[PDB]
DNA sequence: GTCCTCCCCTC
DNA sequence: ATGAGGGGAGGAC
C-alpha cells in the first residue's frame, strides 16, 4: 500500500530487542574504525599533535601512517627509507619490543634502523615486537563504546560494530528534549506515532503510517552518500538512521575527547554496508548510507563482490568462475542476472554443483543460504547479528625469523621463554582490568622451517595459578618443540623462519 | 563424544 | 618467501 510506510510496527518494536534488532529493515548499525590507529597511539604517547607526520615502524616497515604523513604520499608497508625520501621532517616511532633473554617489553625511543648511531639500533635478530600498547588503548576504547551502547562487537584491534537500535528507538518514542528547530521539538513532530505507541492499540503486523511532514526537519549528522540527490527523509528508516547519526557522532566525540583518537564511521541498516562505508571517507568522518541509496553506493565503482566480508579470498574467486561474473560491476551483475528472488540464484548454483565433474569451498547442502547471502549482499540488505565477544578468545606470540637466529632447539626455547613471559603478562593485565580469572586450557606451537614447511602441535596446558602460569606454558612449549624437532629429523628444518605460541582456548571465571 | 591438524578468512 | 587474530571441517583419538 503506497498510502502507508514500507515498514511495520513489528520492525520498529524489534529495534528494542538486542537479539532481533539486526533483522529489521529499520536496523541502525555503526562500524567505527580508528584512524591510523598505531600512529595515533604513538602520537598520543609522545605528546605530539595531529599535524606531526608520525609513522609507526615495525623493523624496517611502516605499519601505520598518520594522516599528516599521508599528505606526503607515504603508504602502509613503505620501507622507512622510502618514507624518509617523501618527507624530510618524518617522525618514525618503532613499536615497543622484548629483548631475547628478558621477560618484559619497553620502548627504545630514538632507536631504529634509520638512526645512524650503532648504539641505538633495534636488531631483528634479538628482539620481538610488543603490540600491547595498542591493545591497551583498544580496550580503553571498548570500555567507552560499551558505556555508550548495549551491544558492541569488537571486530579487530581498532574496529567495533555498534547496534544503535535501543538508543534510536528510545529517542524516537521517549526523548522530550531533542529539538529539530527553534520552534519544533522531536516530541511534537512525532505526536502521531507516540500517541499510537503509548495508546498501545496498534497491531504488530500493521504498517506504520506515512511519516509526518514535520519529521523532515530532522537532520543527519555527517556525510550522507547521495550522488543522485534523493530526498533525505522519506520513511521511518531515514528517521531512525538520522537519529542514529546524531547519537553516533556523540559516541565518536567521547572517544576523541577522552582518548584523543579520531575515527571514521559507516552508518546503515547492515554490518556489511557499514564496514564499506567506514572506509569511504577518512579521517574523522562518518558516511551514512540510506536504504534508498544502497544501490547507488554499492555500484559507485569502488566495490566488487570480493569486497564483501568472507568473499575476499578463494571462495570469492570460485564464485566469480561459477557464476560467470564480470571483472567489474560484479555486484550489479549479480543483482540483475537473478533479479526477482534468491531461488533464481539457488537453481543456478544447484545445477553447477550437481554436475558429476564438479570438484571447492561451496557447500552443496547449503546452496539456499549461499544464494540468499549473495542476493541480499548485492542489494545491501544482508543483516548479520553482532556478537559481544569474551574478554579474550586466543592470544598469540609470534617471531618470524631471519638468518640463523633460530638455528637449534636451544634457540627455540630461548624464544619460547619470551613468548611465555609475554603471554603471562597479558593474562595478568586482563585479570586485573576485568576482575576475572583467565585460565589457558590449550596451547599450540606453530613453526616454519628453512624450506617454509609448517610444523604444528597443540594440546592441553595445566593450570596452577597466575604465579606458575609462565612455567606451565613453557613446560608444554618445550615438549612440543622437541617433539617437532624429532618429526623434522633428516629433513630441511633449521634455521627456522617462524616460531609462534598461541593459547587457543581459555576458561574465564567471573569474580 | 571431544581433540588435533589443516585450512580459510581479515587487517 | 613481511604479528596479530576470528573461525570451521573432518579425520584422529
Ligand atoms: N597487514 C597488517 N599487518 C600488521 N599490522 C597491521 C596490518 N594492517 C593493519 N595493521 C595494524 C596497524 C593499524 O594501525 C591497525 C588498524 O588497521 P587499519 O584500520 O586497517 O589501518 P589504520 O587504522 O592504520 O588506518 P585507517 O585510518 O585506514 O583505519 O592494525
Ligand atoms: Mg583503522
Ligand atoms: Mg581494520
CATH number assigned to the domain comprising residue A497: 3.30.1490.100
Q: In what order do the strands lie in the sheet with A105-106?
A: A105-106, A96-99, A127-130
A457 and A508: one domain?
yes
User: Which ligand ends up closest to the CA of A160?
Assistant: 3
Domain end residue (candidates: A319, A343, A378): A378
| Residues A16 and A204 sit within 8 Å (Cβ to Cβ) | no
Q: Judge whether A281 lies within some domain.
A: yes
Q: Which H or E run contains A439?
A: strand A436-448
User: Does A285 share its domain with A403?
Assistant: no
Show which of A131, A157, A189 is a domain's final residue.
Answer: A131
* Ligand 1, atom nearest to A159 Cα: 19
A156 CA to B9 C1' in angstroms comes to 13
CB A117 within 8 A of CB A128: no
Query: Beta strands A54-58 and A91-94: pairing type?
Result: parallel
Nucleotides of B under 7 A from a protein CB: 3-11
> Which ranges of A437-507 would DSSP assign to H, the alpha helix?
469-487
B2 C1' to A433 CA distance, Å: 32
State the DSSP string of A84-133: HTT-TT-EEEEPEEEETT-S-EE--TT-STT-S-TTS---TTSEEEE-HH
The CATH number covering residue A259 comes to 3.30.70.270
Experimental structure resolution, Å: 1.8
Residue nearest to atom 9 of ligand 1 (CA): A63
Nearest Cα to Cα of residue A272 among A235, A303, A250, A296: A303
- Pick from A303, A311, A358: which is nearest to A331 by CA? A303
Query: Does residue A383 lie within any of the structural domains?
Result: no
**What residue has cell string 577518512?**
A282
| Start-to-end C-alpha separation, chain A | 54
For the CA of A65, the closest atom of ligand 1 is 24
Same domain as A232, residue A312: no
Which nucleotide, over all strands, has the C1' atom closest to the CA of A315?
B8
Query: Which residue, A272, A377, A390, is CA-closest to A325?
Result: A377
The rounded Å distance from CA A298 to ligand 2 centre is 21
Pair A303, A69: CB distance under 8 Å: no
Q: Is residue A223 part of a domain?
A: yes
CA distance A282 to A36: 10
Experimental method: X-ray
For chain A, what is the domain count? Answer: 4
Rounded-to-integer distance, Cα A173 and Cα A472, Å: 55
A76 nearest nt, CA–C1': B11
Q: Assess whether A24 and A155 both reside in one domain.
A: yes
> Which residues, in sequence order, are CB contacts of A434 under 8 Å at separation 6+?
A391
Domain ranges, residue A66 = 35-131
CATH number, residue A307: 1.10.150.20
Q: How far is CA A468 from the centre of its chain?
A: 34
Residues A329 and A295 in one domain: no
Do A289 and A330 lie in one domain? The reply is no
Q: Is the CB of A62 under 6 A from ligand 1?
A: no
Using CA atoms, how far residue A231 sits from A8, A56, A99, A185, A190, in Å, is 21, 43, 60, 21, 19
Tell whether A89 and A199 lie within a shared domain.
no
Nearest CA to A145 out of A160, A166, A133, A157 is that of: A160
Which of A483, A479, A487, A484 has the alpha carbon at shortest distance from A498?
A484
Per the structure block, which three cell numbers stand in for A16?
528494542
Is the distance from the beta carbon of residue A74 to the nearest atom of ligand 1 less than 6 Å?
no
Q: Are residues A193 and A293 in the same domain?
A: yes
A123 and A157 inside one domain: no
C-alpha cell read off for A412: 627455540
Domain termination residue (choose one: A333, A354, A378): A378
Q: CB under 8 Å to A152, separation ≥6 — which residues? A: A142, A145, A146, A160, A161, A162, A163, A386, A388
Element (H, E) at A296: helix A294-298
Together in a domain, A127 and A248? no
H helix and E strand count, chain A = 17, 20
Residue A409 C-alpha cell reads as 632447539
CB A418 within 8 Å of CB A397? yes
Scanning A365-492, the segments in alpha helix (DSSP H) are 367-377, 409-434, 469-487
Helix axes A342-354, A367-377, angle to 10 degrees: 130
Does the residue A384 lie in any domain?
A: no
Same domain for A286 and A192, yes or no, is yes
Helix segments in A161-268, DSSP class H: 165-174, 186-189, 191-199, 236-259
Are A324 and A343 found together in one domain? yes
Our measurement of CA A153 to C1' C8, in angstroms, reads 20
Q: Is there a domain that residue A386 lies in? A: no
Amino acid at each position: 500500500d503506497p498510502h502507508m510506510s514500507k515498514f511495520t510496527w513489528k520492525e520498529l518494536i524489534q529495534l528494542g530487542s538486542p537479539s532481533k534488532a539486526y533483522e529489521s529493515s529499520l536496523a541502525c548499525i555503526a562500524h567505527i574504525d580508528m584512524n591510523a590507529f598505531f600512529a595515533q597511539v604513538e602520537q598520543m604517547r609522545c605528546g605530539l599533535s595531529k599535524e606531526d607526520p608520525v609513522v609507526c615502524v615495525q623493523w624496517n616497515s611502516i605499519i601505520a601512517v598518520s594522516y599528516a604523513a599521508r599528505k606526503y604520499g607515504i603508504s602502509r608497508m613503505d620501507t622507512i627509507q622510502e618514507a624518509l625520501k617523501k618527507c624530510s621532517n618524518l617522525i618514525p616511532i618503532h613499536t615497543a619490543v622484548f629483548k631475547k633473554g628478558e621477560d618484559f617489553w619497553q620502548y627504545h625511543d630514538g632507536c631504529g634502523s634509520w638512526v645512524q648511531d650503532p648504539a641505538k639500533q633495534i636488531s631483528v635478530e634479538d628482539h620481538k615486537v610488543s603490540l600491547e600498547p595498542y591493545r591497551r588503548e583498544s580496550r580503553k576504547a571498548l570500555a567507552i563504546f560499551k558505556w555508550a551502547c548495549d551491544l558492541v562487537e569488537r571486530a579487530s584491534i581498532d574496529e567495533v560494530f555498534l547496534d544503535l537500535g535501543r538508543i534510536c528507538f528510545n529517542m524516537l518514542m521517549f526523548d522530550n528534549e531533542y529539538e529539530l528547530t527553534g520552534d519544533l521539538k522531536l516530541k511534537d513532530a512525532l505526536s502521531n506515532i507516540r500517541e499510537a505507541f503509548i495508546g498501545g492499540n496498534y497491531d504488530i503486523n500493521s504498517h506504520l503510517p506515512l511519516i509526518p511532514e514535520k519529521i523532515k526537519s530532522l537532520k543527519f549528522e555527517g556525510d550522507v552518500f547521495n550522488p543522485e540527490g534523493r530526498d533525505l527523509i522519506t520513511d521511518w528508516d531515514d528517521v531512525i538512521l538520522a537519529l542514529g547519526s546524531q547519537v553516533c557522532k556523540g559516541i565518536r566525540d567521547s572517544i576523541k575527547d577522552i582518548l584523543g583518537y579520531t575515527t571514521s564511521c559507516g552508518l546503515s541498516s547492515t554490518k556489511n554496508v557499514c564496514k564499506l562505508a567506514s572506509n569511504y571517507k577518512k579521517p574523522d568522518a562518518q558516511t551514512i548510507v540510506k536504504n534508498d541509496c544502497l544501490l547507488d553506493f554499492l555500484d559507485c565503482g569502488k566495490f566488487e563482490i570480493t569486497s564483501f566480508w568472507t568473499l575476499g579470498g578463494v571462495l570469492g574467486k570460485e564464485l566469480i568462475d561459477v557464476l560467470d561474473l564480470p571483472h567489474e560491476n560484479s555486484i550489479k551483475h549479480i543483482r540483475e542476472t537473478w533479479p526477482d528472488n534468491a531461488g533464481q540464484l539457488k537453481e543456478f548454483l544447484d545445477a553447477k554443483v550437481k554436475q558429476s565433474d564438479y570438484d571447492s569451498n561451496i557447500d552443496p547442502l547449503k546452496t539456499a543460504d549461499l544464494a540468499e547471502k549473495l542476493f541480499k549482499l548485492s542489494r545491501g540488505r544482508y543483516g548479520l547479528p553482532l556478537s559481544s565477544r569474551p574478554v579474550v578468545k586466543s592470544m598469540m606470540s609470534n617471531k618470524n625469523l631471519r638468518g640463523k637466529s633460530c638455528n637449534s632447539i636451544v634457540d627455540c626455547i630461548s624464544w619460547l621463554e619470551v613468548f611465555c613471559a609475554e603471554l603471562t603478562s597479558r593474562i595478568q593485565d586482563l585479570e586485573q582490568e576485568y576482575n576475572k580469572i583467565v585460565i589457558p586450557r590449550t596451547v599450540s606451537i606453530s613453526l616454519k622451517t628453512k624450506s617454509y614447511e609448517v610444523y604444528r602441535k597443540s594440546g592441553p596446558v595445566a593450570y596452577k595459578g597466575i604465579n606458575f602460569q609462565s612455567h606451565e606454558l613453557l613446560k608444554v612449549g618445550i615438549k612440543f618443540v622437541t617433539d617437532l624437532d624429532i618429526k623434522g629429523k633428516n629433513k630441511s628444518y633449521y634455521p627456522l623462519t617462524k616460531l609462534s605460541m598461541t593459547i587457543t582456548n581459555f576458561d574465564i571465571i567471573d569474580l
